[PDB]
């Protein structure tokens, strides 16, 4: 068959690309880049250099302290037993504060460490957002990456900061652990009545599925047209070639309409962004303006009428 | 205790949902308008009837290009000229296909052999106006990596097993440091370029396999205007010629196989 | 071949073998038996592995019981010296019950597990003192809690229901705060974020029995109306409710849909009648632990108690032992009327 | 109507079945043999859905619920009013999806493109086939398929998930979610980078591979490149669907207990087993 | 051992050493805070904890 | 030690040191606020 | 059998052997530590719990 | 045996040895803290253990 362009075995070693000159006052790029044949198989072979400005170093320091708070408490929760740490690592977490303390500062053993880790991690994420914004400007690029990142931060802040404030308790926020934060996700749905019936949860899923649909379609489109230089997308945007025309005609002949090599990336940008934008809004609504999503769904005529195959039963707590 | 109720039936979450629907309707309108910056207005089977569909075409936007190769405004007020493709319609009614003409359908400009009239100048690098694609005899700072195949000196073979020539040099992308074309010296002394995405480097037998063209059809592939650089338009011509072989190399490849 | 490629292939080869080891060492296989219990397409049904079910049926085989002797003649209350609960039983049936209790509780140790072999009336051994309280517990269950143990059929319970031929039943529980952690300012052991055997080895709370099956903390967390204003239950509380409901599945060998429709957990209009029976099971367990097992704290020796010194307690799996009904609903108390009435 | 550049591309050929008989366009859509077949299955399947809705108790679009047969029917074809209609709609859906994929193959061949797009779509079809035929076949009853209804099939997902009492602990479920979440992160990054390069601040020149690769080397120390990101987009999206199919095929045919219990193999490893 | 600094970069060693020593010191201070006996702030008497399984404060 | 600024960028040292000191100071203030004895706002319980 | 080093590069063999021997020894030491009989620090594992229950609401 | 530093880079060996020994020493110190008997900070008898027969 034809070359499927799955991976690249024929590779050439050129001079390392350090990037465009930076604006006056910027730091020097860190590290000496080197060629790696393994990464050249599936993508670009060069590793480095990296730019570490003020935002990058500040974000790392803030984030590292937060990670240390999580890890030290996780290790203390198994009484410093390394065999138990490896055994239980997925089960461990840094738990959010007890409901007693509301929005106030909890004692260290009862959620105080969680709040400090939440603050330092949030600062690190925000400082990383500045890094994504400023690195784009330094290269003369648009800030689309930073604003897409802000959408992801919105869901993160809604889960851990905005909604706990709206509910009046840091106890509603997720824990810092792998299995426990899955427990929190499930317990959230149990408490607030089947989050499937949250319409913004429906939309977020539609865009999450849609992001997988679009990237499979778009990635497949580019791979199918790499024989025409389809992966050189910006050059296709400013001077349309046969790769762009065939890509547009494939989808027009398939489903009756098509994008362009520029607008497809707008479809992809919004579909990913709307996952966390609609998701964040849905999380802010539950417990604040809706307490049971299934009963809200029943009220708004979206609960399918499933037959009841059992004899009628009365709540035994009422007759007691 | 009814927190979030606006009326007896309308609540806050419902209102926020309808607010999103209005935004999403506007977003789809915006996205569909952006989709219409290329290829619109549509052409019909009427000399001067054009359709823009719904939503209408957006206001023009301008791209500034590097190294004084001009400004591009999309949607174009006057669309780019099309190539003079040679095909005969299979029927007169709208929606019917056409059949490419000529003994070599890969040169007809119809079907998969068509291409766009791109810039007739090489794509330049950003740092310097130097052509982006260059043969490794010119781009001496690029060398083949070890523990990977070296196609120089391999035979160029069509899918029918006929050897069309030998690989003499490779063309690299000076921006991404990768191979994009293999240059082959054909048996008629032609020195054509073959697309790397359409080449299977079999380092076991020392052959570069072409699944798209027979050996004799390789001999009619496009040649460069000058041997050390390739324009954007020439890149489209080369890609169209080789890729159209999957449908035009043999009569079997164009017909239903079952 | 490039060294980085070799390392990547070796790492991929190791992972594939490791995945193969986990997959072939843990997974089950078809055929699987399905018992549909809800409406078509609502995915309310029970799964049963036939190989697991065959093993389960083998260990729930009811032992044959001695035939019941006539109740005419001398009564054990008059004949024997220290008989406080089995007074109305005839001598022949009293001896039959003692033989039955021996096989049900301590078949290996015989009559000497509870009795001084030369003085049967003596209560020197703590086991006899517990046994007398256990008889009262069985009589209490069969008479006053037939809303649960005789919900559909006159099943009832006997000593074998929990003990299964062992002095210590397989399924008991103690007050468990969780494993020891670091002290000082480190995050406290809250009974969560550790592997919880009672909660299917998840990170859900590891002791849901203390607040619910000994104390009477509210299990319900869901609001009964669409909009807020009536419910202040926290996600923290939902953890313990989730953990207790996980223990129900293990205890009965069923899943959530056996008692619930997942689209509304709080709904009783959408629930099978098994949820009503389970509701009384909670109150029965609290009665057993608060009134029978806990007051026996001083009678139990210290090695029979928990790390906190509390007496061993009953929960759902003590009787059910992984089956939707104990011994698949087979009744053993029908030929033991003395175990169905409170003295 | 056709795009400005379209007319030269409308060649005859590329079909797998039929040939010139169905090789024509209706408006912007190419038909071919599988377009006829896809149209037939799609229209019949949709019409049967409406008829099944007509037999139901509501016309509310959100509340229409077409359910599979009872488990007791096994692998037999049930009567139409008791899950037989669901089975017919399922067969139409399977035919429509396969025809759509095969139609895409012919369209890609007509344009001389690779077959990457239908290849990627085939994994979506595999997940659907896992849900409605493969998993029900291993369980021995068509009643295991999800009901056809906008909100009613969420009820099937919810109840199915709680048949294992904590579906987050399903290991293939974790992998599939990791692929879905990473794909959305990758899509947001890729869409942003292209738009940022093609749409710099007003009056500034458009940016190319030097800034695109330079951007992620500056922020993260590595750039996968334009070819790599489109490979990654397919790989992440395809593997999300593949591991989704795995996560549900093992739920019930190969695992009948709570998913958290499955992790006891890790807890009981002899290096740290209690 | 002066000859070792011709083999190891003083920039690399000092930066790696500073990070390593701070993390180690931070870890040891945390471990002491995670003991009752060596807790220097509140002392040896650990405070009582609040109920985790509690409703929202309303 | 005046030569330590010959091999270390003073701009880079000050930025790293400045962030480190502020993060450490935030860490210590946060710890004290979460203690019973050294909470200076609501005081001891 | 000295010829084994004419076939394999010594640098890789020693590094591979050193990594292999440490991981195996770490594996064996940990397996014994998890047992009651061969635990050389405390012996049988008692599974200590926290001193008190977290109070109910 | 001195003919090993020409075969192995001393810089790579010392850095690898330094990381390995520190991680190993952390591992052992951590394990002793987890034990009841060898905990040198809080000492023995830190939790509750059920009596055995
Ligand atoms: C969510 C909802 C998703 C809904 C998706 C709907 C997709 C509809 C496909 C429309 C096809 C089409 O023709 O495009 C028209 C339209 C573009 O029209 P145009 O190019 O401006 O107009 C051309 C001229 O009018 C000139 O046009 P023309 O006259 O050439 O057009 C003729 C066209 C007819 O088109 C129309 O007249 C317009 C119909 C509008 C409905 O074709 C036909 O006549 C069809 C005849 C019947 C035969 C079809 C079957 C034959 C076999 C085909 C193979 C099997 C299928 O494309 C769209 O409207 C697409 C917008 C949909 C965006 C959806 C984005 C996803 C949102 C997901 C949200 C999830 C979270 C919430
Ligand atoms: C039983 C569980 C419930 C359920 C409970 C919830 C809850 C609760 C939530 C969701 C949410 C979502 N659910 Mg749900 N959900 C259910 C069933 C489903 C099903 C299904 C087929 O059954 C699907 C496909 C989904 C899918 C989804 C997504 C659409 C959405 C998550 C978006 C996202 O990508 O967040 C992932 C992305 C983020 C969380 C942002 C991350 C960005 C930050 C910046 C990360 C920084 C990392 C940092 C630098 C590193 C730190 C490392 C340190 C060591 C800590 N759910 C069932 C009904 N679901 C979320 C939502 O938005 O709902 C409206 C949400 O909160
Ligand atoms: C439990 C009973 C005792 C106790 C029992 C023991 C026993 C038994 C031993 C120790 C040993 C040590 N104990 Mg003690 N120890 C206790 C409690 C403590 C406490 C505490 C807070 O309570 C501390 C801080 C320590 C600290 C120490 C260290 C001084 C020492 C481990 C050396 C090491 O890790 O080298 C690791 C670091 C190196 C080897 C440096 C490597 C140099 C390289 C080769 C050169 C190049 C460097 C390279 C460029 C940079 C990378 C290296 C970096 C360090 C990462 N112990 C309790 C009180 N302890 C060990 C010891 O004394 O060793 C001499 C030992 O045998
Ligand atoms: C549109 C929504 C989707 C999305 C988008 C998105 N995410 C993004 C972005 C975008 C557009 C970015 O630009 C940003 C990024 O940088 O991407 C490369 C990012 C990002 N999304 C990430 C994760 C992420 N995204 C997720 C989800 C999503 N992201 C959505 C699906 C998730 C999920 C599903 O949970 C995760 C986990 C990160 C990879 C990145 C943000 C990175 C960040 O915030 O970095 C700072 C955080 C830290 C914890 C600091 C780390 C510190 C180091 C570990 C220290 C190492 C040691 C140290 C050097 C020692 C010395 C220290 C001294 C103090 C001693
Ligand atoms: C992996 C770390 C590799 C690394 O840290 O490499 C460093 C250089 O990093 C550099 O350029 C700067 C780049 C360092 C980071 C490289 C990228 C890390 C992976 C990021 C991409 C994955 C995550 C993306 C999504 C979050 C070390 O460089 P040297 O010691 O000078 O030489 C390395 C020798 O091979 C040749 O001399
Ligand atoms: C599919 C992608 C995800 C769809 C999400 C659907 C959300 C369903 C929840 C819902 O149904 O939201 C409703 C509105 O949704 C609506 O109009 C939605 C109307 C369709 C919006 C556009 C969808 C694409 C076309 C709000 O309730 P009510 O206004 O009281 O409804 C009254 C009747 O319409 C139903 O009894
Ligand atoms: C630190 C690193 C951690 C990664 C660990 C990866 C482990 C991968 C293998 C996991 C094995 C799980 C398993 O294999 O499942 C267990 C079986 O294990 C058995 O036999 C023995 C299983 C054979 C060993 C598996 C292969 C080990 C060697 C290769 C390692 C790579 C399940 O037990 P049962 O079927 O109930 O009864 C087994 C009987 O012998 C009675 O006890
Ligand atoms: C609402 C849909 C409106 C569609 C209007 C339309 O346009 O349908 C046309 C008529 O199709 C035709 O009758 C011939 C095709 C008949 C219907 C299509 C096949 C249906 C199969 C079921 C499409 O045929 P074309 O001549 O290829 O295109 C004409 C356009 O260029 C006009 O500008
Ligand atoms: C496989 C064998 C399927 C036999 C179905 C069958 O049953 O054969 C007949 C009906 O078939 C019917 O119409 C419907 C026949 C259904 C065929 C099922 C197999 C098709 C598989 C398609 C997908 C394969 C993917 C690989 C006879 O039906 P009964 O015996 O009255 O049914 C009683 C049920 O309890 C059986 O479970
Ligand atoms: C040598 O060191 C090592 C040993 C290597 C360290 C090892 C560390 C390790 C292994 C760490 C592992 C960590 C792991 C596995 C973490 C996993 C975390 C997961 C999955 C988290 C998931 C979700 C978490 C979320 C959403 C949390 C959000 C929290 C937020 C937003 C909190 C914000 C509040 C802010 C901004 C405040 O201002 C409040 C602060 C204050 C008022 C003081 O307190 C109230
Ligand atoms: C790929 C092949 C995989 C085959 C898996 C084995 C078939 O799976 C098996 O199907 C049969 C028939 O549907 C089921 O059989 C069950 O339902 C059928 C149909 O009502 C009854 O007639 C039967 O008495 C009952 O046991 C089994 O409970 C199930 O385990
Ligand atoms: Fe792209």
Numbering used by the authors:
A (entry chain M): 2 to 321
B (entry chain H): 1 to 258
C (entry chain C): 1 to 343
D (entry chain L): 2 to 275
E (entry chain S): 1 to 58
F (entry chain Q): 1 to 45
G (entry chain W): 1 to 57
H (entry chain U): 1 to 53
Give sentences from the paper:
Here we present a cryo-EM structure of the light-harvesting 1–reaction center (LH1–RC) complex from Rhodopila globiformis at 2.24 Å resolution. By contrast, the Rhodopila globiformis RC contains a full-length tetra-heme Cyt with its N-terminus embedded in the membrane forming an α-helix as the membrane anchor. Eleven copies of a novel γ-like polypeptide were also identified in the bacteriochlorophyll a-containing Rhodopila globiformis LH1 complex; γ-polypeptides have previously been found only in the LH1 of bacteriochlorophyll b-containing species. Collectively, these data show the Rpi. globiformis LH1–RC complex to be structurally unique among purple bacteria and provide experimental evidence of a phylogenetic link between PufX and the RC Cyt subunit.
The Rpi. globiformis LH1–RC contains 36 molecules of BChls a (32 in the LH1 and 4 in the RC) and 17 keto-carotenoids (16 trans-carotenoids in LH1 and 1 cis-carotenoid in RC), the latter pigments are unique to this species. Based on the density map, one MQ and one UQ were identified at the QA and QB sites in the RC, respectively. In summary, the extensive interactions of the Rpi. globiformis Cyt subunit transmembrane N-terminal domain with surrounding proteins and lipids not only make the subunit structurally unique among anaerobic purple bacteria but firmly anchor the Cyt subunit and thus stabilize the entire LH1–RC complex. Superposition of the RC-M proteins from Rpi. globiformis and Rba. sphaeroides revealed that the C-terminus (Leu55–Gly69) of PufX is indeed closely located and parallel to a loop region (Phe27–Arg40) of the Cyt subunit immediately following its N-terminal transmembrane domain. In addition to anchoring the Rpi. globiformis Cyt subunit by its N-terminal transmembrane domain, four LH1 α-polypeptides tightly associate the soluble portion of the Cyt subunit with their C-termini in a manner similar to that seen with the α3-polypeptide (the longest chain) in the Alc. tepidum LH115 and the α2- and α4-polypeptides (also the longest chains) in the Trv. strain 970 LH114. The γ-like polypeptides interact over the entire range with neighboring β-polypeptides, mainly through hydrophobic interactions, enhancing stability of the LH1 ring.
